[PDB]
Paper text:
The HA glycoprotein on the viral surface is responsible for cell entry and is the main focus of the humoral immune response. The HA RBS is a shallow pocket on the apex of the HA1 globular head, and is formed from four structural elements: the 130-loop, 150-loop, 190-helix, and 220-loop, named after their location on the HA primary sequence. The HA RBS engages host receptor sialylated glycans and consequently is relatively conserved in sequence compared to the rest of HA1.
We further examined the structural basis for the loss of E190D reversibility in recent H3 strains by determining HA structures of HK68 E190D, Wy03, Wy03 D190E, and Mich14. D190E imposed a significant fitness cost in Bris07, Perth09, Vic11, Mich14, and NDako16, but not in Shang93, Mos99, and Wy03. In the panel of the eight strains tested, Bris07 was the earliest strain that lost the E190D reversibility and Wy03 was the latest strain that retained the E190D reversibility. The Cα190-OH98 distances in HK68 WT (Glu190), HK68 E190D, Wy03 WT (Asp190), and Wy03 D190E are around 9.0–9.7 Å, whereas this distance in Fin04, HK05, Vic11, and Mich14 is around 8.5–8.8 Å. Relative to the WT HAs, the mutants bound more weakly or not at all to the array, but when binding was observed, specificity for human-type (α2–6) receptors was strongly maintained. This stronger binding of the WT HAs shows that Glu is preferred at residue 190 of HK68, whereas Asp is preferred in Wy03, even though function is retained.
Residue numbers in the entry:
A (entry chain A), B (entry chain A), C (entry chain A): 9 to 325
Amino acid sequence: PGATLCLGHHAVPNGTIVKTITNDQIEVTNATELVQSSSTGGICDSPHQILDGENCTLIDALLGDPQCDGFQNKKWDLFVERSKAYSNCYPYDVPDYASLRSLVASSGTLEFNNESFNWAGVTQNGTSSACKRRSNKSFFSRLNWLTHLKYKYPALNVTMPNNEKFDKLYIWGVHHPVTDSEQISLYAQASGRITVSTKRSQQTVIPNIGFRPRVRDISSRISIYWTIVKPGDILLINSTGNLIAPRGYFKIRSGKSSIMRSDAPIGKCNSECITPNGSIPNDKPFQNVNRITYGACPRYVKQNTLKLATGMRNVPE
Amino acid sequence: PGATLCLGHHAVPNGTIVKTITNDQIEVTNATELVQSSSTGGICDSPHQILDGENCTLIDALLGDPQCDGFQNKKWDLFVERSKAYSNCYPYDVPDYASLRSLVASSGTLEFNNESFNWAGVTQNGTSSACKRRSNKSFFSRLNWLTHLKYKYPALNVTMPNNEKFDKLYIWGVHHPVTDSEQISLYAQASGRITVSTKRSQQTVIPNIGFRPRVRDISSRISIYWTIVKPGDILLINSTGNLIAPRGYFKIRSGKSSIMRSDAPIGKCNSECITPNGSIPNDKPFQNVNRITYGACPRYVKQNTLKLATGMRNVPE
Amino acid sequence: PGATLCLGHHAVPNGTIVKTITNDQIEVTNATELVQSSSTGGICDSPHQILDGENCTLIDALLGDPQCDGFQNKKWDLFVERSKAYSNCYPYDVPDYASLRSLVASSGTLEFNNESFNWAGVTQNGTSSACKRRSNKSFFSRLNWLTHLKYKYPALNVTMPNNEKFDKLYIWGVHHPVTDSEQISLYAQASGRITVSTKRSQQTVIPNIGFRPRVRDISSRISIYWTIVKPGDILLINSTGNLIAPRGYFKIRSGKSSIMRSDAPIGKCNSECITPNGSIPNDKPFQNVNRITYGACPRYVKQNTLKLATGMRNVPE
Ligand SMILES: *[C@@H]1O[C@H](CO)[C@@H](O[C@@H]2O[C@H](CO)[C@@H](O[C@@H]3O[C@H](CO)[C@@H](O)[C@H](O[C@H]4O[C@H](CO)[C@@H](O)[C@H](O)[C@@H]4O)[C@@H]3O)[C@H](O)[C@H]2NC(C)=O)[C@H](O)[C@H]1NC(C)=O
Ligand SMILES: *[C@@H]1O[C@H](CO)[C@@H](O[C@@H]2O[C@H](CO)[C@@H](O[C@@H]3O[C@H](CO)[C@@H](O)[C@H](O[C@H]4O[C@H](CO)[C@@H](O)[C@H](O)[C@@H]4O)[C@@H]3O)[C@H](O)[C@H]2NC(C)=O)[C@H](O)[C@H]1NC(C)=O
Ligand SMILES: *[C@@H]1O[C@H](CO)[C@@H](O[C@@H]2O[C@H](CO)[C@@H](O[C@@H]3O[C@H](CO)[C@@H](O)[C@H](O[C@H]4O[C@H](CO)[C@@H](O)[C@H](O)[C@@H]4O)[C@@H]3O)[C@H](O)[C@H]2NC(C)=O)[C@H](O)[C@H]1NC(C)=O
Ligand SMILES: *[C@@H]1O[C@H](CO)[C@@H](O[C@@H]2O[C@H](CO)[C@@H](O[C@@H]3O[C@H](CO)[C@@H](O)[C@H](O)[C@@H]3O)[C@H](O)[C@H]2NC(C)=O)[C@H](O)[C@H]1NC(C)=O
Ligand SMILES: *[C@@H]1O[C@H](CO)[C@@H](O[C@@H]2O[C@H](CO)[C@@H](O[C@@H]3O[C@H](CO)[C@@H](O)[C@H](O)[C@@H]3O)[C@H](O)[C@H]2NC(C)=O)[C@H](O)[C@H]1NC(C)=O
Ligand SMILES: *[C@@H]1O[C@H](CO)[C@@H](O[C@@H]2O[C@H](CO)[C@@H](O[C@@H]3O[C@H](CO)[C@@H](O)[C@H](O)[C@@H]3O)[C@H](O)[C@H]2NC(C)=O)[C@H](O)[C@H]1NC(C)=O
Ligand SMILES: *[C@@H]1O[C@H](CO)[C@@H](O[C@@H]2O[C@H](CO)[C@@H](O[C@@H]3O[C@H](CO)[C@@H](O)[C@H](O)[C@@H]3O)[C@H](O)[C@H]2NC(C)=O)[C@H](O)[C@H]1NC(C)=O
Ligand SMILES: *[C@@H]1O[C@H](CO)[C@@H](O[C@@H]2O[C@H](CO)[C@@H](O[C@@H]3O[C@H](CO)[C@@H](O)[C@H](O)[C@@H]3O)[C@H](O)[C@H]2NC(C)=O)[C@H](O)[C@H]1NC(C)=O
Ligand SMILES: *[C@@H]1O[C@H](CO)[C@@H](O[C@@H]2O[C@H](CO)[C@@H](O[C@@H]3O[C@H](CO)[C@@H](O)[C@H](O)[C@@H]3O)[C@H](O)[C@H]2NC(C)=O)[C@H](O)[C@H]1NC(C)=O
Ligand SMILES: *[C@@H]1O[C@H](CO)[C@@H](O[C@@H]2O[C@H](CO)[C@@H](O)[C@H](O)[C@H]2NC(C)=O)[C@H](O)[C@H]1NC(C)=O
Ligand SMILES: *[C@@H]1O[C@H](CO)[C@@H](O[C@@H]2O[C@H](CO)[C@@H](O)[C@H](O)[C@H]2NC(C)=O)[C@H](O)[C@H]1NC(C)=O
Ligand SMILES: *[C@@H]1O[C@H](CO)[C@@H](O[C@@H]2O[C@H](CO)[C@@H](O)[C@H](O)[C@H]2NC(C)=O)[C@H](O)[C@H]1NC(C)=O
Ligand SMILES: *[C@@H]1O[C@H](CO)[C@@H](O)[C@H](O)[C@H]1NC(C)=O
Ligand SMILES: *[C@@H]1O[C@H](CO)[C@@H](O)[C@H](O)[C@H]1NC(C)=O
Ligand SMILES: *[C@@H]1O[C@H](CO)[C@@H](O)[C@H](O)[C@H]1NC(C)=O
Ligand SMILES: *[C@@H]1O[C@H](CO)[C@@H](O)[C@H](O)[C@H]1NC(C)=O
Ligand SMILES: *[C@@H]1O[C@H](CO)[C@@H](O)[C@H](O)[C@H]1NC(C)=O
Ligand SMILES: *[C@@H]1O[C@H](CO)[C@@H](O)[C@H](O)[C@H]1NC(C)=O
Ligand SMILES: *[C@@H]1O[C@H](CO)[C@@H](O)[C@H](O)[C@H]1NC(C)=O
Ligand SMILES: *[C@@H]1O[C@H](CO)[C@@H](O)[C@H](O)[C@H]1NC(C)=O
Ligand SMILES: *[C@@H]1O[C@H](CO)[C@@H](O)[C@H](O)[C@H]1NC(C)=O
């Protein structure tokens, strides 16, 4: 009679369909998903240092909008900007806004150091009812609105050397009055001009008098500029009116900091990968949650699923 | 005696050479080409909506050059700009020309809506012999050349609210006269200035008096600017001379529209993929016709041929 | 008794570990390295035409700094800029510096042709003690500092047609005096203005009077501009003061030229691939020396080694 000896392999009742080079649908015994397609919905506060902007854009926190005083000198790995954020100070613009936002975001600090600028012969600390703190007239915390002193505004020609080891970031502005009479009222002369320089750079800005649509009841504007001063270089501000003066400098660092627009709530939890939709697990190589990511993240792809076979072809009985 | 039974495979007398991982030349029984290397030479008018610019650049059709009146309010999927196109109006430039061209191309419409601007106290509808229609002096159709009225040009301070659901695109300009006397002749004062603003943006432009080389017998110039006004925002134009005024706004849409530079003839035929050399079939995954494409196109590669084996190794008798 | 016949394969005592799809460490009989990770440390002078900038940036060689006269009319495949380079002329800036540097680098020539500009009614060839040659006061070789003649500076309105087959590159500038009295001293009027135009472009620049920090004992500045003039177009310079005039044009070519920042010494040797660290062999497909390359180079990757098996699995006795 003898014997029979059969060689074989396993199978399962519940196989999974995968793609191959020669067939778009072949059943295997098991597979694993390579695309992360879900988020928790919240941004985990760990292990990156998260700073929720709340009502403040980064730029408003930089300048010192009345609603942003709690942000002074804070650092972040990721600054989270909310869609509801709005300004509540003097109406302003920033030529190149995107670049200033980017460079501050990347620096990852609002560390500010006051300096003693000699603003000889003018009135300091101007305020406005468009920028209140506690119902008092106020202004951006990091800027100094200079006006005439006894109807004189003598030329400013002011120096500030950088004798530090690090670069200094200076934020400053120009005031664009609504009318010729507002110009004379504030600065005691018919126009102004501002030249801000270092040994290696120069910027000059001319105020432009005229009506813009009222924002927080103001038809004038401030335009914001910036200047970086290297170790052993010197900031020189030369102006005859309309200067929104710096009060000091921001530290500028390099590192892994960034900024993200998101309305996701921040949670007490730990996740390396952040998207605007919330944190996502990072076990998988790919993800289809968002092209926008921060941290150790899977790579964004268009597919919502990619199944890797982890078993043989399934050939059921 | 018994029998002989031989297993085998086919071969062909006319095999084709392909590349593999281990050999750059191996003969197989059959192959197919994966690189599209030929075009029809014409651009098929279907199924994309093609607009042939003919003598008009997109920007000339936007502004309303005399040769471009047939383009009013037209839409396109693909605007085709011809190398022979030339201007036949007042000589102009557009700072950022490439961006305005791009944003209009992408919007895919020249839909224009007139608005009733209150140009109080000035002469409207200025014309020039450098911009004729039917031998009459004329001007860009979408712009309004304002000049003095009885040797006065009172300050303009004009508002236009956007109470629509959509964004408005405003095109406007500044006139740069050739001399101080041309300046006084046209505007009744020694210089002008233009500030165009919204709640969230501002642009001011100063005219620059002087000689440029004559183009269509004109040594002055117009410089063209634009402003986008969001729903619930307000356009404000504040000017004292030299304003080339808007007559209304363009609609701005988003969608799949673009622009292509090509001299290929447009034909009555149907092809999904357009290149500057003409339409190409899109059965193949790759193509070497042109890096510039529009529609459902094969991907541009440097190779002029890539043969995919569709049969076994050919081993002839 | 019969015989035994065994089939087998070789092995070696000194195998090498490679990576595969299924195993990160498998020993094979032999392998070859696909990542170039070392350089010679020097840049080979062959076969690309190398121009060592020595003390001169490309822009200083363009303008004609006193230390750069040996560079006149030189050509290069690769201009090598040294970190020690410094300027020794009048302090200047170039708005868009990076673009002018790039376009000259890519052109690959400093070929200069003098032209006879009619600077009627002014003093030519101004010099300064901040820009000495051989202890004499001097100036940039390719620029012409115009000042008043007998306390008059009549308006300049000067033309230069391009009747060549090629494009002309014009370099010119604006002088920004330190004070109102320096302005009057040099130009005999209270301000200047410069409009440089062609049939298809225009640039106007306003001088900005004021103090900048002293560089080589100078608190004023020059700002450098450029203009390209096509065949059959015409350069027109219209100015009333502060013009740093062109002396002629640079040829502008297209080809394979570039610029590299490196402190590597130049050697007498032959290598197709240049990096800032020195030339590297180009037998391998990949390299991890530097992302910055010029010539026929392996592709930059992050890995420092990638071993390709060139033999079977090693199975020692
Ligand atoms: C189908 O194929 C997949 C992929 O092979 C397979 O999934 C794998 O299953 C194993 C076993 O369950 C998982 O191993 C676990 O991994 C987690 C980390 O995420 C560990 O926490 C687990 O630890 C347990 O066991 C340890 C033993 O030392 C203990 O230390 C500890 O107490 C834990 O209880 C464990 O190592 C592995 O993560 C997955 N892999 C993937 C990619 O999902 C799945 O099992 C297969 N299914 C079938 C039906 O065969
Ligand atoms: C070498 O290999 C290639 C690739 O396999 C092979 O080319 C293929 O040939 C087949 C058969 O001729 C083609 O099939 C045709 O495809 C077109 C679409 O482009 C259809 O219009 C054709 O329809 C005909 O037959 C249909 C049957 O139902 C009818 O509906 C109709 O009336 C038509 O007459 C047909 O399906 C196929 O497109 C190509 N593929 C490629 C990539 O070219 C070629 O035949 C092989 N050569 C040899 C000598 O073996
Ligand atoms: C392990 O695998 C590698 C890769 O296969 C293998 O390296 C190769 O070795 C051969 C033989 O030494 C090399 O061939 C030489 O290539 C150089 C060019 O760089 C030539 O100059 C050499 O020419 C000599 O021989 C010629 C014969 O006609 C003569 O013309 C001349 O006089 C020269 O003496 C020769 O062709 C080849 O370059 C390498 N390849 C790589 C990628 O390194 C290595 O030998 C293997 N090791 C073992 C132990 O098996
Ligand atoms: C130039 O044009 C602008 C824009 O039209 C004019 O601005 C407008 O000025 C009026 C008068 O001051 C403003 O009215 C105010 O509205 C607020 C809000 O309801 C109200 O609280 C005040 O009591 C007053 O009614 C109006 O807001 C403002 N509009 C805009 C869009 O800014 C300006 O007056 C013109 N200038 C001249 C000199 O004509
Ligand atoms: C750059 O800084 C300098 C240094 O302060 C400024 O120059 C100075 O400007 C003042 C006032 O504008 C000048 O004084 C005036 O002199 C005239 C002429 O006699 C007189 O009519 C006025 O009543 C007043 O006294 C001063 O002369 C001048 N100093 C120098 C050394 O030139 C300059 O204004 C600053 N630039 C900017 C853009 O602010
Ligand atoms: C400033 O310089 C410019 C450039 O050289 C001068 O422009 C030139 O002006 C002359 C005189 O008007 C123009 O001549 C005209 O040429 C046309 C074309 O053939 C002809 O039809 C007219 O009858 C006349 O001859 C010339 O075209 C023009 N050149 C350029 C390049 O624009 C300008 O005159 C100078 N201004 C002053 C005040 O000197
Ligand atoms: C921005 O829009 C306003 C509103 O029209 C313009 O301000 C107004 O400008 C006019 C004419 O330039 C001023 O009138 C002049 O007053 C002087 C001083 O008495 C007189 O010498 C002139 O004969 C003329 O009457 C008017 O006062 C002024 N209005 C206000 C409220 O300040 C302004 O010009 C516009 N800006 C631009 C850049 O166009
Ligand atoms: C406006 O402010 C600037 C910046 O503080 C002043 O520039 C400074 O001017 C002084 C006086 O000329 C310069 O002093 C010189 O220093 C050199 C170098 O040691 C020395 O050789 C000279 O004998 C003299 O002492 C100083 O270098 C310069 N500083 C900078 C940073 O540029 C300018 O004087 C002010 N203008 C007015 C009108 O007040
Ligand atoms: C653009 O080039 C033209 C052509 O030279 C310049 O225009 C000319 O400028 C001069 C001097 O600025 C003017 O002369 C002056 O006339 C007045 C009025 O009588 C007088 O007070 C002065 O003493 C002097 O004679 C000349 O009239 C004028 N020519 C023309 C045809 O308008 C212009 O200045 C140049 N632009 C720039 C930005 O340099
Ligand atoms: C994560 O958020 C993104 C961004 O909002 C979502 O992507 C959008 O999805 C909507 C459909 O509801 C599309 O209309 C948009 O085109 C997408 N936005 C952009 C900017 O491309 C996405 O659905 C979210 N993913 C998960 C897993 O929650
Ligand atoms: C399609 O048009 C392109 C663009 O003109 C052609 O590519 C050019 O080919 C010429 C040779 O005649 C080269 O000198 C140029 O370098 C190419 N132009 C550019 C801009 O790179 C191409 O030959 C055409 N292809 C087909 C199939 O007609
Ligand atoms: C070639 O030069 C580059 C550039 O300096 C070297 O890369 C740097 O390596 C240092 C470590 O000493 C790092 O701190 C820097 O991040 C690298 N620089 C940049 C700009 O990324 C590299 O080591 C050199 N390679 C060889 C083979 O000599
Ligand atoms: C098949 O069933 C087993 C046991 O319930 C399970 O662990 C495995 O993941 C299933 N296969 C699927 C879901 O494809
Ligand atoms: C943000 O602003 C809203 C009003 O716009 C206010 O209700 C809320 O309390 C503010 N939040 C903070 C943190 O200041
Ligand atoms: C301006 O305000 C600061 C506090 O913000 C104060 O220290 C300083 O003395 C004030 N200076 C003047 C001149 O008012
Ligand atoms: C070989 O000949 C057949 C019959 O003529 C043809 O259909 C096939 O495409 C040919 N092979 C080529 C052109 O490589
Ligand atoms: C375009 O311009 C040329 C003359 O430059 C003319 O012959 C042709 O008819 C014009 N075409 C159209 C459509 O206006
Ligand atoms: C300007 O021209 C338009 C037609 O283009 C006309 O409706 C309008 O009445 C004219 N206005 C003036 C003031 O000439
Ligand atoms: C093994 O030894 C031989 C002979 O010395 C040598 O040629 C070969 O490259 C060696 N293998 C290595 C270094 O992996
Ligand atoms: C470059 O400058 C240094 C001084 O800074 C000098 O020693 C050297 O000789 C100069 N080299 C050349 C080639 O001019
Ligand atoms: C200016 O200098 C050049 C030599 O650099 C000389 O040929 C020319 O004659 C000089 N012109 C004047 C007006 O000084």
